[PDB]
Structure formats: structure tokens, C-alpha cells
Amino acid sequence: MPVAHVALPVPLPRTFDYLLPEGMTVKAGCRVRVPFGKQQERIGIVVSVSDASELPLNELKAVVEVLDSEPVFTHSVWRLLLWAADYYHHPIGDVLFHALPILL
Amino acid sequence: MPVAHVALPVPLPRTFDYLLPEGMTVKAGCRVRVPFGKQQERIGIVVSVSDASELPLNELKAVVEVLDSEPVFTHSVWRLLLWAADYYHHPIGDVLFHALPILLR
């Protein structure tokens, strides 16, 4: 058949890059609505903000809107969760979202 | 200001789709050489083979070479591993490649 879905041992935090439009600011631990797939949106959680993407600064899509001015996560809670993710081999996205509810 | 590394609640097994050139055939549980990054190669294990990707069937990179005629994993072992990865929430690629050196050795 066509598409071979393959598995690879990507680096620890597997994240998806998106560009921040002019004047839009967000820090680590903030929820943001971003594009996903040819047309729908979805809530995500910003893990970090760098000045380098594994692909060009132009074919990355842009965040649509920040939903939190301040981290929905405690400085401690955040450090902890990222650790657990890494220590027990769980994807950051999975820990973070499954962790959001219990928190609120 | 520019970029941001975002965590997403992606579906159970987060896999990387690769196109199969004409005449190239591979089954679940087989290792394959695939591109990665603007120029490096790497070894991975096919989890499944379908007729569709979240991306255009032309924007995907192509598998380079299949390293296994047959599943390097037993039909039981395989079923178990995928389950283990799912139920305990471990990256399928992470469970598959670590176990290989155990099961074989």
C-alpha cells in the first residue's frame, strides 16, 4: 500500500513548531489554539519558546490565539510534570493534557 | 518571538508516515531505513501500512530500504508490545526499540 507509518525514537519532548505572529506573546505553560491538519484547530500547550525551528521560519503555521496570560501550571507543578514525562517515558503532550483537568 | 515548541494530545501511536516507492513492500513489525532531518538516515519499525496519511501522498519522504523480509518480532510479542505501549502510555517507538535487544538477545 501507500503510506508506511513508521516509528522512530525522536528526541525526548516531541513537539510541533508554530510561528508567533507580530506582537503575540506567550510563555511556557500557556494554552494556545493552533492549526492542525488541512483545516481544523486545536488547543495545545506551549512547552518552550526558542528562536530556532527544525524547518524554515516561513513554512511553519502560526498560532491563532493565546488562551492564557499566565501559566495554567505552577512553576513547581510544571517542572514536576515535564520530569515525569521524561523519567517514565510518557509523551509530554499526554502528561500535560491528562494533567490539566485534575489540576483545575 | 518567532517559534515555540508545543506539546499536543496526539492519538495513541504517534508515527511518522513515509511513502513506499513502486515495487517496495513491507509488513507490520519490519525494520526500515528512512530519511530524518534535511539529510540524515535512521532505522525504524513499521507499525502499520494503510492507504492514507494526514499529509499529501507526495509530500511524504520515501522509505529507503526494508531491512526485514519478515517481522523481527513474533506475532504474540508484537501484539503484546503495542498493547503495553498503549495501556501504560509509552511511545510505541520507545517500547519497540528498547525491547528488541532484550527479546533477541
Side-chain angles (χ1 to χ4, degrees):
Chain A
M1 273 182 274
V3 295
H5 322 282
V6 156
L8 316 135
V10 113
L12 198 206
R14 198 216 51 166
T15 61
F16 306 76
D17 310 315
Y18 284 94
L19 169 70
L20 258 176
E22 178 246 291
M24 194 173 253
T25 183
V26 302
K27 46 176 186 167
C30 299
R31 295 195 295 293
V32 314
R33 185 185 281 87
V34 306
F36 197 104
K38 178 204 168 188
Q39 203 194 68
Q40 269 40 64
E41 303 209 43
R42 256 138 206 176
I43 304 179
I45 313 194
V46 183
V47 176
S48 88
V49 198
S50 74
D51 289 306
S53 174
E54 170 262 67
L55 228 90
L57 254 107
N58 225 172
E59 207 121 23
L60 77 188
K61 302 155 189 168
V63 182
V64 158
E65 184 187 47
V66 38
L67 294 64
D68 297 293
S69 87
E70 212 60 33
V72 62
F73 297 100
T74 291
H75 274 80
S76 193
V77 161
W78 177 265
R79 179 197 297 91
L80 187 272
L81 288 188
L82 296 191
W83 172 66
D86 168 276
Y87 188 88
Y88 298 111
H89 308 55
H90 292 316
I92 334 277
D94 181 297
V95 169
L96 284 177
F97 286 106
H98 291 312
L100 206 46
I102 296 68
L103 269 162
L104 310 184
Chain B
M1 300 175 260
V3 201
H5 307 304
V6 187
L8 284 181
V10 291
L12 174 61
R14 75 188 185 190
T15 180
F16 295 67
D17 316 294
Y18 293 81
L19 174 63
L20 286 59
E22 204 180 355
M24 177 178 269
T25 204
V26 302
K27 277 172 294 301
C30 315
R31 296 123 64 199
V32 303
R33 247 187 175 73
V34 326
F36 211 72
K38 217 217 74 179
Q39 217 149 314
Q40 316 187 307
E41 303 237 78
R42 189 155 304 171
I43 307 302
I45 292 169
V46 183
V47 165
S48 44
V49 180
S50 89
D51 269 303
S53 167
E54 176 211 286
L55 279 61
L57 233 60
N58 69 299
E59 297 178 4
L60 296 176
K61 296 184 178 185
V63 156
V64 176
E65 163 189 307
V66 59
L67 315 169
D68 287 297
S69 307
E70 246 42 59
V72 65
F73 288 154
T74 308
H75 187 63
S76 300
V77 174
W78 181 262
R79 192 194 313 174
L80 259 176
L81 295 163
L82 299 172
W83 165 77
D86 188 1
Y87 187 63
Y88 298 117
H89 290 77
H90 294 302
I92 214 293
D94 175 339
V95 173
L96 280 182
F97 283 74
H98 279 319
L100 186 64
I102 270 66
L103 300 147
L104 291 175
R105 191 167 271 166

